[PDB]
Amino acid sequence: RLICINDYEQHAKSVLPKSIYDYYRSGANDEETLADNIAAFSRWKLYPRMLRNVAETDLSTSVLGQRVSMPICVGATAMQRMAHVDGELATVRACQSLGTGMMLSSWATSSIEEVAEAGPEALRWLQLYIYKDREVTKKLVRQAEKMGYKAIFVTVDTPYLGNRLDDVRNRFKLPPQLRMKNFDSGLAAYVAKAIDPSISWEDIKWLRRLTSLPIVAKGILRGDDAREAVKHGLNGILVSNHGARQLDGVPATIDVLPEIVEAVEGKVEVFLDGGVRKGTDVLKALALGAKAVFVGRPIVWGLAFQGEKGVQDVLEILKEEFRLAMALSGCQNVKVIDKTLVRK
Numbered sequence: 048r049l050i051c052i053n054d055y056e057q058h059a060k061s062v063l064p065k066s067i068y069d070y071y072r073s074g075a076n077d078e079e080t081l082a083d084n085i086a087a088f089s090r091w092k093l094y095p096r097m098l099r100n101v102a103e104t105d106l107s108t109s110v111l112g113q114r115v116s117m118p119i120c121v122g123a124t125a126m127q128r129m130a131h132v133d134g135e136l137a138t139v140r141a142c143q144s145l146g147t148g149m150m151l152s153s154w155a156t157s158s159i160e161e162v163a164e165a166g167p168e169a170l171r172w173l174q175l176y177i178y179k180d181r182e183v184t185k186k187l188v189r190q191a192e193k194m195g196y197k198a199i200f201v202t203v204d205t206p207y208l209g210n211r212l213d214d215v216r217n218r219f220k221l222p223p224q225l226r227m228k229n230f231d232s233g234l235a236a237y238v239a240k241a242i243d244p245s246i247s248w249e250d251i252k253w254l255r256r257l258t259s260l261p262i263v264a265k266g267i268l269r270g271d272d273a274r275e276a277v278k279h280g281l282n283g284i285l286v287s288n289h290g291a292r293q294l295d296g297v298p299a300t301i302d303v304l305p306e307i308v309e310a311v312e313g314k315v316e317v318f319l320d321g322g323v324r325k326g327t328d329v330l331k332a333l334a335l336g337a338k339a340v341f342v343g344r345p346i347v348w349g350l351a352f353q354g355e356k357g358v359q360d361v362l363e364i365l366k367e368e369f370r371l372a373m374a375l376s377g378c379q380n381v382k383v384i385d386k387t388l389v390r391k
């Protein structure tokens with residue numbers, strides 16, 4: 048049956064209710080960037096080296112000083128219990144099995160503590176939204192610290208929610224039994240009520256003082272903003288267009304990655320998300336200077352198939368595709384994945 052990530056999406060469409068599948072699938076507005084996040088990867092071509100000896104391929108690397116089994120991590124996707132009863136608990140259990148990290152959404156259908164308890168040995172980070180209520184925001188950070196999370200990914204591209212047309216048509220909301228467990232389109236209205244449109248670099252200063260945990264700015268698309276993040280003492284940049292769900296018509300993340308890598312001058316790690324579906328996508332992102340990539344939608348499709356097992360299957364497929372791509376490219380380990388491997 049399911050042998051690549053595209054197969055998992057197709058299966059998910061057949062088993063999920065339309066409103067739930069559309070919530071997960073959709074981009075903003077006409078979905079121009081959604082298509083481009085995938086198409087852009089295909090424009091970057093590979094220039095493999097032969098006869099390098101790839102008998103022993105080592106996929107391991109590090110994210111903010113913590114070892115991972117591969118440069119492929121789970122990105123924050125809200126409300127995972129819509130896809131499978133076990134939701135974020137299934138996800139964290141799979142990450143623990145694989146030896147990779149899970150970024151937990153602030154809008155999760157499972158708590159910061161429920162997830163630490165299900166995956167005590169897993170590498171775990173918290174994705175933070177800055178709520179109008181700074182006390183709520185502090186509590187989330189403090190819980191992350193107490194429960195053994197290793198970094199804060201602060202999302203900086205969402206002063207308001209993007210306009211996803213299917214969610215408006217469907218009047219999207221949670222199924223009746225579910226809740227965000229740490230507290231038109233229903234989600235757009237929620238954001239308007241809860242999330243602060245005023246946040247500025249001064250609020251990053253506040254956050255930097257609040258915690259000693261590593262902080263990564265998630266959603267940066269400009270080199271000038273990346274340099275400002277470095278100036279504020281942040282510890283990484285996640286080059287992201289929010290899975291094409293915020294401003295439509297921004298570039299693909301693979302296309303802006305080189306500008307951002309250049310701008311930070313090696314001072315902090317740079318990551319990527321948006322459109323990663325294949326092992327060659329991962330290879331391309333590393334050749335252009337990313338330390339690791341995050342996957343969003345593929346994880347939700349794993350859940351929709353078979354919960355924990357379906358997430359593990361998706362991560363295993365990406366791991367094996369990546370291993371093969373490295374080997375066929377002449378790369379024994381991630382340290383030798385260089386810029387001459389790709390051209391646009």
Ligand SMILES: Cc1cc2c(cc1C)N(C[C@H](O)[C@H](O)[C@H](O)COP(=O)(O)O)c1[nH]c(=O)[nH]c(=O)c1N2
Binds near residue numbers: 070122124125152
């Ligand atoms: C259904 C769904 C739900 C969320 C997201 C995305 C999607 C598709 N994303 C953005 C996410 O972290 C990531 O940037 C993208 O999913 C990456 O793109 P791909 O889905 O892998 O193409 C997201 N980001 C975030 O900071 N907080 C959140 O709660 C969510 N929730």
